[PDB]
Symmetry: none
């Protein structure tokens, strides 16, 4: 669960959105008369009409994630 | 669960949004007459009509995450 | 659960939003006549019509997170 | 749960919002005739129509978080 | 669960979206009178009408993920 | 579950979307009067009308993933 | 489950989409009065009307994946 | 050009229309760089997607019309 | 041009319209750089998506019309 | 041009309209750089999405009209 | 041009309109750099999204009209 | 041009309108750099989103109209 | 131009309007750098979002009108 | 131009208006750098969001009008 990124030294990014009547639902839990529900999120949930991820890592860059589920 | 980032040294970012009648729901828990519900979030939930992530890591950069669920 | 970032030394960022009738709900817990509900948030919930994250890490930069759930 | 950031030395940031009839709800707990509800928040909940996070870490910079839930 | 990325040194990115009546649902759990449901997410769920991932890794860049499910 | 990417040194990307009446559902779990359902996601679920992944790895770049399911 | 990519040094990408009445469903689990269902995803599910993957690896680039299912 | 109707004394009418994207042009005169155009209407021009004429004459009822065109 | 109607004495009418995006143009004269145009209307021009004429004459009822065009 | 109607003595009318984005143009004269245009209306121009004429004449009832055009 | 109506003696009318974004133009004269335009109206121009004419003549009732155009 | 109506003796009318963003233009004369324009109205121009004319003549009732245009 | 109405003897009218953002323009003359414009109105111009004319003539009732235009 | 009405003898009227942001322009003359404009009104111009004319003539009732335009 360890992330490292070291950097040693010795343009135009455009997003254009023109929406009419836009409805966005992200992580949603809708229920009625239920018994048990689990929504375990540990990653990267990106939800939307204009979902843009430009130049996520440019220099030295690290990401990490870890999820689990134990019930026994 | 350890993140490190060391940097040693020896443009135009545009987002344009023009929305009419925009409704955004993020992490939502809607229920009625239920018994148990769990919404465990530990990642990165990004929800929206114009969801833009530009140049997240430019120099030395690190991210980390860790989630769990134990019931026994 | 340890984060470190050391830096040793020896543009235009535009967001434009023009919304008419914008409704945003973040972390929400709506219920009626229920028994138990848990909304454990420890990550980074970003919810909105114009959700922009520009140049999150530019120099030496570190983030961390840790969540848990034990019921026994 | 330890964060450190040391820095040794030896542009225009624009947000423009023009909203008509904007309603924002953050962390909300709405209920009626329920039994128990928990909303444990320890991360970073950012909720809003123009939610902008520009240049979060520029020099040496560290963030940390830690959440838990034990019921036994 | 370890990710590392080190970089040593010794254009126009356009997204254009013009949507009318756009509805986006991300990670959703809809149920009625059920017994148990689990939605374990630890990867990278990207959901949206204009879902663009441009130049994800440009310099030295690493990603990682790990998920599990144990019931016994 | 280890990913590494090291880089040592010694154009126009266009997406154009014009949608009328666009509906996108990502990871969805719809049920009624069921007993158990599991949706374990640990890869990379990209869902949308204009789903574009341009120049994912440009320099030194690594990705990784790992999923599991044990019931006993 | 190990991926590495090291790079040492010593055009126009167009996507054009014009859709009318576009409906996209990604990973979906629809059921009624069932007993058990599992949707284990660990690869790369890309679902959409204009699903374009241009120049996925340009420099040194590696991907990996691993899935499992044990019931005993 | 004389109409008369004398009456001496000594159910359900349903129209149901459900249209999506309906465009109706009635008496139209579209031209460019012309010399002369005449649209003489004296009858009964009924133009439309659901054009219904139910029970036009039920009791004593008379209609009449007369048109002309002289140029010499 | 004379109309008369004399009457001596000694149900449910339903129209249902449900339109989405309905455009109606009646008597229209569109031109550019023309010389002469005449639109002589003296009848009964009824133009529309749901154009219903129910029970126009029920008792004693008379209609009349007369049009002309002389240029010499 | 004479109309008379004499009457001597010795239900439910429903219109239901549910329109979204309805545009109606009646008698219109649109031109540019023209010389002469005439729109002579003397009848009954009824223009609209829900154009209903229910029970126009019920008792003794008379209508009349007369139009002309002389230029010499 | 004479109208007479004499009467000697010896239900529910419903209109329901529910419009969103309704634009109505009646008698309109739009021009640019023209020479002459005439819009002679003497009849009955009824223009609108819900144009309803219920029970126009119930007892003794008369209407009349007369238009002309002379230029010589 | 004479109208007479003599009467000798010896229910629920509902209009329901629920409009959002309604724009109505009646008799309009829009021009630029023109020479002459005439809008002669003498009839009955009724323009509007909910244009209802219920029970116009109930007892003895007469209407009349007369228009002209002479230029010589 | 003579109107007479003599009467010798020997319910619920509802209008309901609920408008949001309603703009009404009646008889309008908009121009720029023109030469001559005439708007001769002598009839009955009724312009509005909820334009209702209920029970215009109930007893003995007469209306009249007369317009002209001479230029020579 | 003579109107007479003689009468010899020997319910609930509801208007309900609930408007938000209502703008009404009646007889308007807007111009710039023009030469001549005439707005001759002699009829009955009724302009407004809730324009209701209920029970205009109930007993013996007469109306009249007369307009002219001479330029020579």
């Amino acid at each position: 669960v360890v992330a490292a990124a070291e950097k040693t030294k010795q343009g135009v990014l455009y997003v254009g959105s023109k929406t009419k009547e836009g409805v966005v639902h992200g992580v949603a839990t809708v229920a009625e008369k239920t018994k048990e529900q689990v929504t375990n999120v540990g990653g990267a949930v990106v939800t939307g009409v204009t979902a843009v991820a430009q130049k996520t890592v440019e220099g030295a860059g690290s990401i990490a994630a870890a999820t689990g589920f134990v019930k026994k």
